[PDB]
C-alpha cells in the first residue's frame, strides 16, 4: 500500500532530477575546449624504481614534501621510502598481513592502515623511542576497510566493504560521523583541498558527495556501468574523476550534477584500479589492470601518453603536490617513479 | 655522499636485510584458505586441526601452517577473493548432513559457493581438499529422509554407500576444465582424528609440484 | 683443404651460443631476480661462454693463417682454461638434475631446511675441482709455463675420464630416480613433459657433451683425427649452443 | 628514555679501563652511539662512533688505535675500552644517542657522563665571542664561523647548536640550521650562509643560560668549538 | 705431449 | 521497508533542491583553470635537469 506509493514518489523525484540537470547542458566539455592546442605527446621515463617488497602492492600515498612516501604490501609491510635517495626510512610490520589501504598525514607524523581485518591502525612515526609503534586501533567496521584518508592528526575518513563511510576521533578512538547512503561496497575515497566535504564511489556504480561536519549526502552521480574502483578530485575541488571496471574514465562537475567526460577507448577492456589528476588539472593519469597506465588529456579526452613498464597489474599511482613526479606500484612488487 | 646520507644508506641496507629474512621465513609456511557455510561445520575441522579473517597457525611435521577464514566477511567477496591468488590450498567444508536442510536447500548453496570458487580466475591451479563433515547424522538420516529430496534424479539405493559416492560425484563434477587442479575429497566425522594427515599428503602434492616449478622442468 | 666445412659448422653453431648465454647471463645479472636454483643456470652460461668463445677464437686463428698464412699462432695456455670451462658444463648439469630429484624425494626438506647458501657453495667447489683438474693436466702435458710429460697427462686424462664417467653416472642415477618416483606415486605432475625432458636432458649429455671430452681425454690414448675430432667438436659446441635452451628458455615460457 | 653512564675514576698511567653505558627506554639496536669528551674546564670534543648494526666504527686521531668502541645490543650497553690511558684524557665522557634517516634529529640525546682522572683536513669551528653579559628579556645573537663551507650539495647544512647549562648535560637545539629540536622553546632560531653562522635568542629567561656549542657534522672527525658562554 | 687440435 | 523508502525519499527531496550551473560555465572554469596554472606543472611541460630533484 504505502510502500508502492512510496516506490512512484521516489521515481517521480528521480525523474525531476533527471530532468533538471538535463536541462542546464547547452554545451559539452568537448565543443568549448575544440579550440585549445593539445598536448603533444607525454613522455615520462622511470627515474627511480623502488624494490624491496616481496609480494603484491595495494596502496601508496606521497607525503605532502613530495619527497617521502609509504607503501602497503601483503607480505605484512608498510615501507616508507625517500623516493630521492631511493633509501628507505622505516619498515613497519603489520599485525595482519591483508592490507588493501594506506594513508599518509599531511603532518607527517602519521600513517594508517587497514584491510580485511576491518581496522583501521594508526602509527605514530615520530616519537621518543626510535621505532614507529601503533597509537590506535580504529574498529567500527564490520567489512574491509577501501581507503583511508587524514583529514588532520586527529581526524580520519575511512570507507569500508559494508557500505559505509565513518568520520573518526583518533584520540578517543570512535568514530564521530556514519555516512550510510550506499547500496554496495565503497571502494575509493578522495578528500576535497578544502577538507570541508569528500566523495566516495562504491560497488553499485554511484558516487557520491558527502558533507563532512553535517554528516549528509548532498548529491548523487550515476554515470558508470560497473564497480567504482577509483575516485580523484579536480585540483580546484569543483570536478572529480572516477574510475570503474567497465574500462572507462569519467569526470562529474559538482556545481553542473552530471558527467562533463567520458575517457574511453576500444582496445581498452580491462578494469581501472587507480585515478590521478596532474597539478594543473591538464592531464588524468588512470592504472589499469593490462599492467600499465595510461595518460589522459581531461580536457579533450584523447591518450596523451602510455606508461609503460609494469609486469603485473597497476593497483595504486599518486602524483607529488608539486607535479614533479607520479608514483605507480602494481602487484609486480615494484614502485616506479616517472617524470 | 654525506656522513648523514652515508648512515642513511647503511639503515636502508639493514632494512634490505630483515626484509630479506622476513620473506625468506613468510615462502616457507603453507596457506590454507578455509571455506564454507556457518553449520557446515569448520569450527569441528579447526579444533581437529589446533570480527575480520581469523587467523589459525599450526604445526604437523616440520610444516607451518597457517588457515585463513574469511565467514565473518559478509560483503561481494569478488573485491578480495584475489588477495588469495597466492595461497597453498583451499580447504571447502560441505556437511552432507544438510541435504534434507533448508536456508533454497543448503546443499546446493554449496554446490553454487563450490562452482564460484572452483573455476574462479584467481584459483586456475589451486588443489581443493573438499571435507564431507557430520558422516554420522548423514547415515542417521538417510534411512528415513531419502536423497530425492535435494537430487530428484537420484535413482539409487538408499544406503550411506551410494548416496555419499553420489555426493562426491556431484562436488567434483562441478569441477569445470578438470585437468588442470585437483580436488581431494575425505569423509570425516566429529571423533575422528585422520584429517591433518589428509591435509599434509594433499600439502606434499602442491609442494612436489612447487618446487619442481622453481627447478625450471615444471 | 676439404676440411673447411667443419670449421664453418663449428662457428655457425657457436654464433648462435655466444648469443644465447650472453643474453641467459644478462638476464640474470640484474634482470630479474635468482632463486636458489639461478645461480646453477650462471654457472652454465659462464661456462658455456668461455668454451665457446675459445672455439671461436681458435676458428678465427685459423681462418687467418689460412687467407693470411703470414700469420701468428694462439698460446697452448688458453687450452687448459677452456678444458675447466668444458668440466664445469658437464658439472652443473648433473648437480642441476641432482637437485631436481632431491625436490622430488625430501620436497619438505628442499622446501623448509635448505640452507640459503648450499647452492653457491656447490657452484664454487665444482668449479674449484674442475680448474683443478684442468691446470693439472695443463702443467704435467705440455700446455702451460713448462716442459711436457707424458706418462702424466695419460695418467690424469684417465682420472678426468672417470670424473667424466661419473658426472654421467651420477645424471642417470638422479633421472631415473625421478622418474620411477614420478611413475610410482604422482599426482598433479604432466608427465609426459617430465619425461621428454628428463630424457632430452640424458641424450643431450650422452650425444653431445661427452663425445669431446671422452674422445680428448681416453680415445686418443687408447685408439683418425680429422674423421673424429672435428664432429667431436661440432657435438660439443652443440651441446653448448642448445643448453641455455634447455634450461632457462624453455621454461620462462 | 635514558643512557646511564658507568664507569671511569682515577687510574694510574699508562693503565686501561672500560667506560660503559647502559640503555633505558628506547630502541637501542637503531640508534648510532657517539662517545663525546670534555676537559675539566675547557670545550668539547668528539672521540668515537659506533653506527647501528656495529657495520662502521670511526675513531677520533687522538685516540685512534688507542681506543675500542663496542656495543651489546641484547644487552643494552655501550662500552668503550681504553688503553694506555695519557694524561691528555682526562675529561668527561659523554654517550649520545643519534639516528639517521632522512629529517632525523642526530645527537638529541645525551647521557651524564664519567669523570676520568689520570694522575700526575679537520674543519676548524671558531667562535670568536666569549662570556656576553646578558639580561632577562633582551634578544642575544651568537656567531660561528666554519673553516669551510658546511652546505653540502644535497641542500643541508650540517650545523648543529647545542646548550649545556651549568651542572647539566648539554642539549641539542639545533641540528641543522633553524632547525628547531623537539621540546626546545620557539624562541630559539637559527639562520647562516657557508661559513658564516649564528643562533638567535629572541626573548631569554634565566634557563636558557649556559655555554652553546657549535658542531659540524659535514664529515669526521666531528670538530666542535669553543663555547660562547651566557652570563646573567 | 698430446696432440692439440 | 516503509522506513528505507520513506528515507530514500527524503535523501532524493534534498538531491532535488539543488541549485545547477550549465555545463558551458563549468567547463569554462575547468579550462580557465587548467590555462592559469599550465606554467606551474612539470608534468606538462618538461623541466630542465637543473629543476629536476628526479635526475
Request: with cysteine; proline share 3%; glycine share 6%.
Amino acid at each position: 500500500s504505502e510502500l508502492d506509493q512510496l516506490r512512484q514518489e521516489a521515481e517521480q523525484l528521480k525523474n525531476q532530477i533527471r530532468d533538471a540537470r538535463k536541462a542546464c547542458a547547452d554545451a559539452t566539455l568537448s565543443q568549448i575546449t575544440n579550440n585549445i592546442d593539445p598536448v603533444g605527446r607525454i613522455q615520462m621515463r622511470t627515474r627511480r624504481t623502488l624494490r624491496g617488497h616481496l609480494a603484491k602492492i595495494y596502496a601508496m600515498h606521497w607525503g605532502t614534501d613530495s619527497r617521502l612516501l609509504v607503501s602497503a604490501s601483503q607480505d605484512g609491510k608498510l615501507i616508507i621510502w625517500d623516493s630521492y635517495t631511493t633509501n628507505k626510512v622505516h619498515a613497519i610490520p603489520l599485525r595482519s598481513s591483508w592490507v588493501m589501504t594506506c594513508a599518509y598525514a599531511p603532518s607527517g607524523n602519521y600513517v594508517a592502515c587497514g584491510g580485511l581485518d576491518n581496522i583501521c591502525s594508526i602509527y605514530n612515526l615520530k616519537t621518543r623511542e626510535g621505532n614507529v609503534r601503533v597509537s590506535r586501533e580504529l574498529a567500527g567496521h564490520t567489512g574491509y576497510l577501501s581507503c583511508c584518508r587524514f583529514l588532520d592528526d586527529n581526524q580520519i575518513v575511512t570507507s569500508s566493504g559494508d557500505t559505509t563511510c565513518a568520520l573518526w576521533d583518533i584520540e578517543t578512538g570512535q568514530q564521530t560521523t556514519t555516512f550510510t547512503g550506499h547500496t554496495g561496497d565503497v571502494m575509493s575515497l578522495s578528500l576535497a583541498p578544502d577538507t570541508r566535504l569528500f566523495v566516495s564511489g562504491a560497488c553499485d556504480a554511484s558516487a557520491k558527495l558527502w558533507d563532512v561536519r553535517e554528516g549528509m549526502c548532498r548529491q548523487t552521480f550515476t554515470g558508470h556501468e560497473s564497480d567504482i574502483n577509483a575516485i580523484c578530485f579536480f585540483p580546484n575541488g569543483n570536478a572529480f574523476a572516477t574510475g570503474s571496471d567497465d574500462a572507462t574514465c569519467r569526470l562529474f562537475d559538482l556545481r553542473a550534477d552530471q558527467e562533463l567526460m567520458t575517457y574511453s577507448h576500444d582496445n581498452i577492456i580491462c578494469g581501472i584500479t587507480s585515478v590521478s589528476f596532474s597539478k594543473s588539472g591538464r592531464l588524468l593519469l588512470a592504472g589499469y589492470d593490462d599492467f600499465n597506465c595510461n595518460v589522459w588529456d581531461a580536457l579533450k579526452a584523447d591518450r596523451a601518453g602510455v606508461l609503460a613498464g609494469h609486469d603485473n597489474r597497476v593497483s595504486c599511482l599518486g602524483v607529488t603536490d608539486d607535479g614533479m613526479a607520479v608514483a605507480t606500484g602494481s602487484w609486480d612488487s615494484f614502485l616506479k617513479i616517472w617524470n | 655522499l654525506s656522513a648523514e646520507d652515508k648512515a642513511a644508506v647503511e639503515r636502508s641496507k639493514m632494512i634490505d636485510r630483515n626484509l630479506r629474512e622476513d620473506g625468506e621465513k613468510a615462502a616457507r609456511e603453507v596457506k590454507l584458505l578455509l571455506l564454507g557455510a556457518g553449520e557446515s561445520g569448520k569450527n569441528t575441522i579447526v579444533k581437529q586441526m589446533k570480527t575480520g579473517i581469523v587467523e589459525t597457525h599450526f604445526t604437523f611435521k616440520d610444516l607451518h601452517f597457517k588457515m585463513f577464514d574469511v565467514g565473518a566477511q559478509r560483503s561481494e567477496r569478488k573485491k578480495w577473493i584475489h588477495c588469495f591468488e597466492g595461497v597453498t590450498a583451499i580447504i571447502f567444508c560441505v556437511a552432507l548432513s544438510d541435504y534434507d536442510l533448508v536456508l533454497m536447500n543448503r546443499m546446493h548453496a554449496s554446490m553454487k559457493l563450490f562452482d564460484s570458487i572452483c573455476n574462479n580466475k584467481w584459483f586456475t591451479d589451486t588443489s581443493i581438499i573438499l571435507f564431507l563433515n557430520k558422516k554420522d547424522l548423514f547415515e542417521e538420516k538417510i534411512k528415513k529422509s531419502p536423497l530425492t529430496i535435494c537430487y530428484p534424479e537420484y535413482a539409487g539405493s538408499n544406503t550411506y554407500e551410494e548416496a555419499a559416492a553420489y555426493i562426491q560425484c556431484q562436488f567434483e563434477d562441478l569441477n569445470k576444465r578438470k585437468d588442470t587442479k585437483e580436488i581431494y575429497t575425505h569423509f570425516t566425522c566429529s571423533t575422528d582424528t585422520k584429517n591433518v594427515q589428509f591435509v599434509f599428503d594433499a600439502v606434499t602434492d602442491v609442494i612436489i609440484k612447487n618446487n619442481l616449478k622453481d627447478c625450471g622442468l615444471f | 683443404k676439404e676440411t673447411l666445412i667443419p670449421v664453418f659448422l663449428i662457428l655457425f653453431i657457436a654464433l648462435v651460443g655466444l648469443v644465447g648465454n650472453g643474453f641467459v647471463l644478462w638476464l640474470l645479472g640484474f634482470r630479474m631476480r635468482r632463486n636458489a636454483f639461478s645461480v646453477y643456470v650462471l654457472s652454465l652460461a659462464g661456462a658455456d661462454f668461455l668454451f665457446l668463445c675459445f672455439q671461436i677464437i681458435n676458428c678465427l686463428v685459423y681462418l687467418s693463417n689460412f687467407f693470411c698464412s703470414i700469420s701468428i699462432n694462439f698460446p697452448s695456455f688458453f687450452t687448459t682454461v677452456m678444458t675447466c670451462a668444458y668440466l664445469a658444463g658437464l658439472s652443473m648439469l648433473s648437480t642441476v638434475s641432482t637437485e631436481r630429484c632431491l625436490s622430488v624425494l625430501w620436497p619438505i626438506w628442499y622446501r623448509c631446511r635448505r640452507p640459503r647458501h648450499l647452492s653457491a657453495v656447490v657452484c664454487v667447489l665444482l668449479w674449484a675441482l674442475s680448474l683443478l683438474l684442468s691446470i693439472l693436466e695443463g702443467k704435467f702435458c705440455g700446455f702451460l709455463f713448462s716442459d711436457g710429460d707424458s706418462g702424466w697427462c695419460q695418467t690424469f686424462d684417465f682420472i678426468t675420464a672417470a670424473w667424466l664417467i661419473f658426472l654421467f653416472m651420477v645424471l642417470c642415477g638422479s633421472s631415473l630416480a625421478l622418474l620411477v618416483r614420478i611413475l610410482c606415486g604422482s599426482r598433479g605432475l604432466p608427465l609426459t613433459r617430465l619425461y621428454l625432458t628428463i630424457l632430452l636432458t640424458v641424450l643431450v649429455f650422452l650425444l653431445c657433451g661427452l663425445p669431446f671430452g671422452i674422445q680428448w681425454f681416453l680415445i686418443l690414448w687408447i685408439w683418425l683425427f680429422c674423421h673424429i675430432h672435428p664432429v667431436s667438436v661440432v657435438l660439443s659446441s652443440l651441446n653448448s649452443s642448445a643448453n641455455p635452451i634447455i634450461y632457462f628458455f624453455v621454461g620462462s615460457f | 628514555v635514558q643512557l646511564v653512564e658507568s664507569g671511569g675514576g682515577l687510574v694510574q698511567p699508562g693503565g686501561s679501563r672500560k667506560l660503559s653505558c647502559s640503555a633505558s627506554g628506547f630502541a637501542f639496536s637503531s640508534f648510532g652511539m657517539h662517545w663525546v669528551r670534555q676537559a675539566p674546564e675547557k670545550g668539547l670534543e668528539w672521540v668515537a662512533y659506533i653506527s647501528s648494526g656495529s657495520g662502521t666504527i670511526y675513531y677520533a686521531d687522538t685516540v685512534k688505535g688507542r681506543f675500542t668502541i663496542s656495543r651489546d645490543d641484547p644487552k643494552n650497553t655501550l662500552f668503550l675500552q681504553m688503553t694506555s690511558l695519557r694524561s691528555e684524557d682526562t675529561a668527561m665522557y659523554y654517550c649520545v644517542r643519534s639516528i639517521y634517516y632522512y629529517g632525523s634529529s642526530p645527537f638529541d640525546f645525551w647521557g651524564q657522563g664519567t669523570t676520568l682522572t689520570v694522575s700526575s683536513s679537520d674543519i676548524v669551528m671558531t667562535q670568536a665571542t666569549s662570556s656576553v653579559p646578558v639580561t632577562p628579556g633582551e634578544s642575544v645573537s651568537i656567531s660561528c664561523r666554519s673553516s669551510k663551507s658546511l652546505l653540502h650539495s644535497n641542500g643541508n647544512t650540517y650545523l648543529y647548536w647545542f646548550l649545556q647549562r651549568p651542572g647539566q648535560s648539554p642539549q641539542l637545539l639545533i641540528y641543522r640550521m633553524s632547525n628547531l629540536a623537539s621540546g626546545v622553546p620557539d624562541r630559539f632560531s637559527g639562520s647562516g650562509s657557508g661559513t658564516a653562522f649564528t643562533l638567535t635568542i629572541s626573548r631569554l629567561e634565566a634557563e636558557d643560560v649556559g655555554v652553546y656549542y657549535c658542531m659540524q657534522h659535514l664529515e669526521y672527525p666531528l670538530t666542535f668549538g669553543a663555547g660562547t658562554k651566557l652570563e646573567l | 705431449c698430446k696432440n692439440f687440435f | 521497508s516503509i522506513a528505507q523508502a520513506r528515507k530514500l525519499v527524503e535523501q532524493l527531496k534534498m538531491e532535488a533542491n539543488i541549485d545547477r550551473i550549465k555545463v558551458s560555465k563549468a567547463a569554462a572554469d575547468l579550462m580557465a583553470y587548467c590555462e592559469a596554472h599550465a606554467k606551474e606543472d612539470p608534468l606538462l611541460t618538461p623541466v630542465p635537469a637543473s629543476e629536476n630533484p628526479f635526475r
